[PDB]
Amino acid sequence: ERETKIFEEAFTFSENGFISPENLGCLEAVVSLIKLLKTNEWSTVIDKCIHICLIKNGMDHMYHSFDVPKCFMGNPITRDINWVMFREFINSLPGTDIPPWNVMTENFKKKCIALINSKFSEFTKLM
């Protein structure tokens, strides 16, 4: 209860709340982004914590119905990952300042941007 209330107010990313369809849309890309790259310790901590939070609020089925959204594919069957738009999503992610999730959120964002470099706002209003 205590640490989940802290983590829900740490990943609000919107105005309505942690249960709104816009926040559930923007968490989907992060959970999808995680499952989609190299298994990091910070990435799997963020994944398990979002999973615990969606179990608590009664949205576990909506967690297990996650995939990449339609605003990151080029074709439905041809699984293509629009990395430039995804980098714009991660770069425009309003990560909060409250400890201890600000440091972890910032390091998560840095290693995701760094790993997509090593391979080579409007988003939440859309989804």
UniProtKB/Swiss-Prot annotation:
It is found in: Host Golgi apparatus; Host endoplasmic reticulum; Host endoplasmic reticulum-Golgi intermediate compartment; Virion. It comes from the Viruses. Zn(2+) binds at residues 51, 60, 64. Homomultimer. Interacts with the glycoprotein N; this interaction allows efficient polymerase packaging into virus particles. Interacts with nucleoprotein N. Belongs to the Bunyavirales RNA polymerase family. Classified as His(+) endonuclease since it has a histidine upstream of the active site that coordinates the first cation. The N-terminus contains the endonuclease activity (endoN). The central region contains the RdRp activity. The C-terminus contains the cap-binding region. RNA-dependent RNA polymerase, which is responsible for the replication and transcription of the viral RNA genome using antigenomic RNA as an intermediate. During transcription, synthesizes subgenomic RNAs and assures their capping by a cap-snatching mechanism, which involves the endonuclease activity cleaving the host capped pre-mRNAs. These short capped RNAs are then used as primers for viral transcription. The 3'-end of subgenomic mRNAs molecules are not polyadenylated. During replication, the polymerase binds the 5' and 3' vRNA extremities at distinct sites. This is RNA-directed RNA polymerase L. It comes from Bunyavirus La Crosse. The lineage of its organism: Viruses, Riboviria, Orthornavirae, Negarnaviricota, Polyploviricotina. The chain holds residues 2119 to 2251 of 2263 of the full protein.
